[PDB]
Write an enzyme that holds these catalytic residues in place. Structure first.
Site, PDB file in Angstrom:
ATOM      1  N   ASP A  11      37.972  39.851  37.830  1.00  0.00           N
ATOM      2  CA  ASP A  11      36.713  39.288  37.372  1.00  0.00           C
ATOM      3  C   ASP A  11      35.567  39.940  38.144  1.00  0.00           C
ATOM      4  O   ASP A  11      35.754  40.923  38.874  1.00  0.00           O
ATOM      5  CB  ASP A  11      36.704  37.755  37.422  1.00  0.00           C
ATOM      6  CG  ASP A  11      36.633  37.192  38.835  1.00  0.00           C
ATOM      7  OD1 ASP A  11      36.684  37.976  39.810  1.00  0.00           O
ATOM      8  OD2 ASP A  11      36.535  35.941  38.956  1.00  0.00           O
ATOM      9  N   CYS A  70      40.911  38.335  41.804  1.00  0.00           N
ATOM     10  CA  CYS A  70      39.840  37.362  41.693  1.00  0.00           C
ATOM     11  C   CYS A  70      39.543  36.825  43.092  1.00  0.00           C
ATOM     12  O   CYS A  70      40.139  37.283  44.061  1.00  0.00           O
ATOM     13  CB  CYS A  70      40.123  36.281  40.638  1.00  0.00           C
ATOM     14  SG  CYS A  70      41.544  35.285  40.961  1.00  0.00           S
ATOM     15  N   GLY A  71      38.614  35.874  43.222  1.00  0.00           N
ATOM     16  CA  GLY A  71      38.195  35.394  44.533  1.00  0.00           C
ATOM     17  C   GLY A  71      39.336  35.094  45.495  1.00  0.00           C
ATOM     18  O   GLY A  71      39.339  35.582  46.634  1.00  0.00           O
ATOM     19  N   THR A  72      40.305  34.293  45.047  1.00  0.00           N
ATOM     20  CA  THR A  72      41.446  33.903  45.871  1.00  0.00           C
ATOM     21  C   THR A  72      42.768  34.480  45.385  1.00  0.00           C
ATOM     22  O   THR A  72      43.751  34.444  46.132  1.00  0.00           O
ATOM     23  CB  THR A  72      41.597  32.379  45.889  1.00  0.00           C
ATOM     24  OG1 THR A  72      41.782  31.947  44.537  1.00  0.00           O
ATOM     25  CG2 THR A  72      40.391  31.695  46.526  1.00  0.00           C
ATOM     26  N   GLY A  73      42.816  34.992  44.153  1.00  0.00           N
ATOM     27  CA  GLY A  73      44.043  35.367  43.485  1.00  0.00           C
ATOM     28  C   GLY A  73      44.678  34.265  42.658  1.00  0.00           C
ATOM     29  O   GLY A  73      45.569  34.550  41.855  1.00  0.00           O
ATOM     30  N   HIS A 103      62.457  39.831  46.281  1.00  0.00           N
ATOM     31  CA  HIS A 103      63.040  38.555  45.881  1.00  0.00           C
ATOM     32  C   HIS A 103      62.575  38.094  44.509  1.00  0.00           C
ATOM     33  O   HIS A 103      63.381  37.596  43.721  1.00  0.00           O
ATOM     34  CB  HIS A 103      62.687  37.454  46.887  1.00  0.00           C
ATOM     35  CG  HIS A 103      63.409  37.565  48.184  1.00  0.00           C
ATOM     36  ND1 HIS A 103      63.495  36.514  49.070  1.00  0.00           N
ATOM     37  CD2 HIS A 103      64.090  38.593  48.745  1.00  0.00           C
ATOM     38  CE1 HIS A 103      64.192  36.893  50.127  1.00  0.00           C
ATOM     39  NE2 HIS A 103      64.569  38.148  49.952  1.00  0.00           N
ATOM     40  N   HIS A 138      68.858  36.784  43.728  1.00  0.00           N
ATOM     41  CA  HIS A 138      67.502  36.764  43.203  1.00  0.00           C
ATOM     42  C   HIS A 138      67.486  36.963  41.699  1.00  0.00           C
ATOM     43  O   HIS A 138      66.619  36.407  41.015  1.00  0.00           O
ATOM     44  CB  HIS A 138      66.669  37.822  43.911  1.00  0.00           C
ATOM     45  CG  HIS A 138      66.819  37.781  45.394  1.00  0.00           C
ATOM     46  ND1 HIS A 138      66.389  36.712  46.150  1.00  0.00           N
ATOM     47  CD2 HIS A 138      67.396  38.652  46.256  1.00  0.00           C
ATOM     48  CE1 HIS A 138      66.679  36.936  47.419  1.00  0.00           C
ATOM     49  NE2 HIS A 138      67.284  38.109  47.511  1.00  0.00           N
TER      50      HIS A 138
HETATM   51  O1  LIG Z   1      38.730  32.811  42.704  1.00  0.00           O
HETATM   52  C1  LIG Z   1      38.623  32.702  41.500  1.00  0.00           C
HETATM   53  C2  LIG Z   1      39.661  32.006  40.644  1.00  0.00           C
HETATM   54  O2  LIG Z   1      40.760  31.574  41.438  1.00  0.00           O
HETATM   55  C3  LIG Z   1      37.362  33.226  40.794  1.00  0.00           C
HETATM   56  O3  LIG Z   1      37.116  34.573  41.146  1.00  0.00           O
HETATM   57  C4  LIG Z   1      36.243  32.308  41.291  1.00  0.00           C
HETATM   58  O4  LIG Z   1      36.558  30.970  40.913  1.00  0.00           O
HETATM   59  C5  LIG Z   1      34.888  32.703  40.746  1.00  0.00           C
HETATM   60  O5  LIG Z   1      33.892  31.945  41.456  1.00  0.00           O
HETATM   61  P1  LIG Z   1      32.347  32.110  41.059  1.00  0.00           P
HETATM   62  O6  LIG Z   1      32.201  31.727  39.599  1.00  0.00           O
HETATM   63  O7  LIG Z   1      31.610  31.192  41.992  1.00  0.00           O
HETATM   64  O8  LIG Z   1      31.991  33.579  41.260  1.00  0.00           O
END
Ligand SMILES: O=C(CO)[C@H](O)[C@H](O)COP(=O)(O)O
Length: 152
Positions: A11, A70-73, A103, A138
């Site tokens: 994203d 993405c921000g956290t994955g 695994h 696995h």
């Molecule tokens: O980490 C994410 C999903 O897990 C997205 O990248 C995140 O939620 C986007 O945040 P924002 O709209 O504040 O940029």
């Protein structure tokens, strides 16, 4: 290797890392397919890009790979795992990167843009690609996941 494709997307949070990874892997002679986004939109939606990658992997789930950022994955991992034949692993440390292949036989690697450095993410990618599925017990476990999604 020339026998499979790696599809990569993110994203809006992950454009710089996406280019770093894509060009890194192209230099290593992988077949790399950047599915976007190709410019920054602060409001864009990670599921759209997760499904672009995961739907491609679904067509060649035994050979092709995906990389999603993405921000956290977390979000791309949830979304990619909805796709038939996809096994998506969220890795935020080099310490678990090989295991996601060894695994879990993951065919989609999910990465954090906000909580993991570019350097660590490159190391995660490299170790994920270098590792091999270890089969055995696995395989029995992965087979249970595949059977659930096919029969439910
Ligand atoms: O980490 C994410 C999903 O897990 C997205 O990248 C995140 O939620 C986007 O945040 P924002 O709209 O504040 O940029």
């Amino acid at each position: 290797h020339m026998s499979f494709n790696i599809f990569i997307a993110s994203d809006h949070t992950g454009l710089t890392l996406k280019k770093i990874i894509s060009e890194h892997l192209k230099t290593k002679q992988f077949n790399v397919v950047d599915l976007g986004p190709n410019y920054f939109d602060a409001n864009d939606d990670y599921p759209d890009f997760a499904f672009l990658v995961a739907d491609k992997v679904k067509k060649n789930s035994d050979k092709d790979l995906g990389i999603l950022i993405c921000g956290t994955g977390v979000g791309v991992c949830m979304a990619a795992n909805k796709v038939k034949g996809v096994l998506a692993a969220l890795v935020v440390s080099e310490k678990t990167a090989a295991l996601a292949r060894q695994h879990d036989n993951a065919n989609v690697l999910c990465l954090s843009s906000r909580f993991v450095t570019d350097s660590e993410n490159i190391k995660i990618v490299d170790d994920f690609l270098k590792a091999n599925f270890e089969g055995g017990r696995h395989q029995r476990r992965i087979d249970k996941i595949i059977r659930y999604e096919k029969e439910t």
